[PDB]
């Protein structure tokens, strides 16, 4: 078979600027290449067809080609609507296959994300259960590392993420993250500290609270 | 514009066959062939299965023995009868029938056994940081319920701008969510900081004001 | 519409020509890769040219030629190779047949006229559509005939559009020779039907096989010609790989565009061949084809006509060749 | 066009009518 | 060697293939001058329309920048057809021999 | 090339009663062009005459 793999994903790049969303067939399917204007939960555009001709209704700012083996949606003029997923797809051969998908991000500059780590609740602590939590608003890029510390400890197991991604425009980048906890895992731990490292400082950025402390 | 479409988001109950559809339009597919596709989120639309102008099904392995295709070439329909990553949106395009180019929305399927879990909403203060800050961040995190989402709002809102509502991620497959909010120190705790929540299918609301420390 | 058709029509009168002898048409599997519409029309008019006919029936000249692009044109557009393209094959191993097979030093050039116009005859205004379609698809052209309605359609439009404008090639020939000519084209056109062919072939081969055939028992020598119009009417196949994959997978997708009518239209459950299905295994259903008319026909087409060996060796050719893609 | 019922399932599901 | 196409009675270069005429165009509307002249060959019939953009030495081009560009018109027009007569006899009677391959 | 396709040989001057070294060098160049003429012009005929009576034998097929 012939997998349409897309090494492309989450590029985050200035509007009006030149960019290109890579695929690579695993064989060969001729001029027979279809490029597409994928968005989660709605309905994907198709960009080109026969390698080079182009959708009907999509604007021809865009560029998509690649032939055989080798392929590049190389995107010119890219909006803030071009900043959605898009995938390669074979018509060339059964099985058809597609790309991973590509949500281009426009690029802004770095920016620290408001920390906080927060103490689970004595309320919280009622449940038999405890997730000790931080809040990280607001950063660029989402290369975001976030750095637990349970009594001073990294903790990769237990933690868990939720976090907003890409805005259509600016992309801004949010992210809380927890860390589900059993009511002896939290207690009878009592340093926690939330630190942060990004390249928006080279610093993680700190907030902490011994458990003493609330 | 010329479209596909289907179902918007579901959640089924795991065991639960879920009926998929995908409802061509602005093109009779009556001389086309129609591929259904799987997307497992942010990655390749992982083939399903096709069927011809011959009217006969066609299945993927993996669909196969699983998935149940009806489709019609003359009504431009074809339904998909049918885990986590099954928990998904479900992608399906067309093809000239002499050859060898439009999307649904993509049915965004949630398989999950869990009904009536109620949301454990916990308040959520910083133990005061030796730091000594002014803008001070505030924070909640709804926990294990299910399904997807609760609502919540900061004091109903007025504290809702520049909200930080992070999605809720799986616990055993109970969703939990860590929602934040900042205020000053020089306003605080004269400003009343309140997640307050509701949980629908569950049939559990939870208000909590975020009292001082917890 | 009809101005860019006329436009191609001084694409006739302002193209350089090239000869047959450098057009490979005399060699049977030749290239009808790079030939146009208007080429093959050329060759189309060789096809009358050296058949000794023209001469010896006092065809008109451009009446004769748009004779050939007239028959052009007609075909609806729709339809893949069944179009003029088919009648080039046709004629080409007719005019092959009847020249470098040599057979004139035997048959009668009046057999050679005969065979000719049937051979361009065979498929006249075809729709992409065989008998049974419009046996089945209820077309009035259906209802209108029984057996072999489409090549009863073809003597029809070979005794009709010959004697209609534009297409009087006929008008030359002696009553006698008109007679020898309709009727015998009627019967042959009648087996340009591979159909009716298998009805007529079994004296044939019973006349063949023993080396006792004689051109001085006239009937067995218009059987021997119906038997080169079946020949003729699917040379296609004899044509080279690079060029027959187009060809005969043109004969998948044609009898799939048709097969797309057989499950829409017609709804059957699908046979095999047809089935668009059998992409990797339709070739296997043409040798069952091939082997049910081409072979059986050319083997009396080797020990009577001679030259014309090639017209089976350029078949036969095409069969493991096929069987590859038959072979997934 | 009546023929061989040998020949007929080959005129069924092979290129002629 | 992307081919282009205009016919005899469109355009002003296709007036100069319905005439032959050599037609100088001092002011074009970086072109700025075409020296629009036929390609010609034995005879001054069209074979063809030459067309030059963007003079050196002088900015327009002159009475000067025709006839001469004519004269080397003859030895290209020559070398056209009489090339081009070499390939025609190529490949078609190379494709001869090529149809001579049964016999 | 200096490579002997033949041997030319003028008889009789007219202006000077002898050949000259003059006499030898413009023969020469003027055997460049005939020179040319006759490999290319013979170079056409070769292939006019060969590759004609290949169609010549392509008669039968």
Known sequence: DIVMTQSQKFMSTSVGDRVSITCKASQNVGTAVAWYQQKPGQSPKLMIYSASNRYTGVPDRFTGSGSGTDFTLTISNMQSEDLADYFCQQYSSYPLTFGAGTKLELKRADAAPTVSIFPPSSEQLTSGGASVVCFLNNFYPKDINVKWKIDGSERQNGVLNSATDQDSKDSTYSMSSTLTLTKDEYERHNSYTCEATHKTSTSPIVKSFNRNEC | ?214 | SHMEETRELQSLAAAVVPSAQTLKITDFSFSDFELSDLETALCTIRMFTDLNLVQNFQMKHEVLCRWILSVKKNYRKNVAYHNWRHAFNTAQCMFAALKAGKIQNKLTDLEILALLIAALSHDLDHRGVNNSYIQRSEHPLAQLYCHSIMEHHHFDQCLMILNSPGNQILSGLSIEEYKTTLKIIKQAILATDLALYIKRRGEFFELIRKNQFNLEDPHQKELFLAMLMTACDLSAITKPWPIQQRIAELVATEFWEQGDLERTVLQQQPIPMMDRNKRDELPKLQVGFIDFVCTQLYEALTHVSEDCFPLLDGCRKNRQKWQALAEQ | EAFNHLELHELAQYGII | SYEIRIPADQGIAGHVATTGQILNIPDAYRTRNILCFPIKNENQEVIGVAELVNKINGPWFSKFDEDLATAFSIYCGISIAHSLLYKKVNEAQYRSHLANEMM
Request: net charge negative.
């Open chain 2, 1 to 214: 514009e010329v479209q596909l479409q289907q179902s918007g988001a579901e959640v089924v109950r795991s065991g639960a066959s879920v009926k998929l559809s995908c409802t061509a339009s602005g093109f009779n597919i009556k001389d086309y062939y129609i591929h259904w596709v799987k997307q497992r989120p942010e990655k390749g639309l992982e083939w399903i299965g096709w069927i011809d102008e011959i009217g006969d099904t066609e299945y993927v392995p993996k669909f196969q023995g699983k998935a149940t295709m009806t489709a019609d070439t003359s009504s431009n329909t074809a339904y998909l009868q049918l885990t986590s990553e099954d928990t998904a949106v479900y992608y399906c395009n067309a093809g000239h029938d002499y050859d060898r180019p439009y999307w649904g929305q993509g049915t965004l399927v949630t398989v999950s056994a869990a009904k009536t879990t109620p949301p454990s909403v916990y308040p959520l203060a910083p133990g005061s940081a030796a730091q000594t800050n002014s803008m001070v961040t505030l924070g909640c995190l709804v926990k294990g319920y299910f399904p997807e989402p609760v609502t919540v709002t900061w004091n109903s809102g007025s504290l809702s701008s520049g909200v930080h509502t992070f999605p809720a991620v799986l616990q055993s497959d109970l969703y939990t969510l860590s929602s934040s909010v900042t205020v000053p120190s020089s306003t605080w705790p004269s400003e009343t900081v309140t997640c307050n929540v509701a949980h629908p299918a569950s049939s559990t609301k939870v208000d909590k004001k975020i009292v001082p420390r917890d």
